[PDB]
Amino acid sequence: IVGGYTCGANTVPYQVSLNSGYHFCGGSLINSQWVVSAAHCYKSGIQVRLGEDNINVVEGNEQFISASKSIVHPSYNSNTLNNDIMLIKLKSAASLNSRVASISLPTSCASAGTQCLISGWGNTKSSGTSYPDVLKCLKAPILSDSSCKSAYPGQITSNMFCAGYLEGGKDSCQGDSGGPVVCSGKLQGIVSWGSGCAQKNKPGVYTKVCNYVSWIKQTIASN
Numbered sequence: 662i663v664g665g666y667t668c669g670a671n672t673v674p675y676q677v678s679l680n681s682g683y684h685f686c687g688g689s690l691i692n693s694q695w696v697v698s699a700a701h702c703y704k705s706g707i708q709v710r711l712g713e714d715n716i717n718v719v720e721g722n723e724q725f726i727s728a729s730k731s732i733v734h735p736s737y738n739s740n741t742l743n744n745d746i747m748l749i750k751l752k753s754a755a756s757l758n759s760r761v762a763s764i765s766l767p768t769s770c771a772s773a774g775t776q777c778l779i780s781g782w783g784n785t786k787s788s789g790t791s792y793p794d795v796l797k798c799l800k801a802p803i804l805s806d807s808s809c810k811s812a813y814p815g816q817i818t819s820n821m822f823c824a825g826y827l828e829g830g831k832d833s834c835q836g837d838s839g840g841p842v843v844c845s846g847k848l849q850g851i852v853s854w855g856s857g858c859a860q861k862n863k864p865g866v867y868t869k870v871c872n873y874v875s876w877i878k879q880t881i882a883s884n
């Protein structure tokens with residue numbers, strides 16, 4: 662997250678860190694046994710870490726659970742990143758408490774102009790690399806689809822939306838992939854891609870979760 666702030670320990674209780682010996686992607690807890698992340702974060706051997714704030718210090722509120730199965734969307738295209746969403750089932754159910762909570766799925770899609778909260782442990786520099794140990798947050802609005810499409814011609818599909826600031830300065834970045842975009846208490850997006858980070862006229866692109874609620878509900882009920 663570039664141009665963001667320190668969230669504060671466990672202020673984003675649904676945020677998860679996917680670890681394969683090191684943190685490589687974020688995700689969101691949707692219920693005690695399931696996590697949603699980005700399909701491009703797929704790896705074999707994932708351990709999900711819940712209740713984290715500093716990912717390099719065991720502070721007492723973490724739950725480390727291995728994944729039993731991962732399901733990448735049937736139509737994920739790694740070349741275009743269309744349908745960049747995946748579900749991860751935990752080996753054991755997590756224990757929900759104040760610090761570990763799940764986030765709700767949307768009933769409808771959010772409108773351009775809606776402010777959201779984006780969080781992650783990704784890079785904090787636009788031209789440079791500095792990875793933080795604690796969770797960073799960024800409040801950003803959903804942008805109109807025309808500003809999204811003019812920034813990325815021929816690359817935006819109806820399963821993606823842009824959020825951020827066209828002036829640059831504030832944005833999600835590498836290491837934030839798979840993490841949450843929560844607007845009005847619902848999970849509306851997943852950090853997916855972009856061009857550099859916090860550059861002018863290159864906002865971040867997010868998977869549009871409201872288009873996958875049926876697939877999510879159906880898949881978790883049958884697995």
Ligand SMILES: NC(=[NH2+])c1cc2cccnc2s1
Nearest residue numbers: 833834835854855857858865
């Ligand atoms: N919001 C951005 N500028 C992002 C760029 C990338 C690049 C790779 C992975 N994730 C992201 S997010």
Ligand SMILES: [Ca+2]
Nearest residue numbers: 715718719720
């Ligand atoms: Ca920790």
Ligand SMILES: [Mg+2]
Nearest residue numbers: 687780781840
């Ligand atoms: Mg994240």
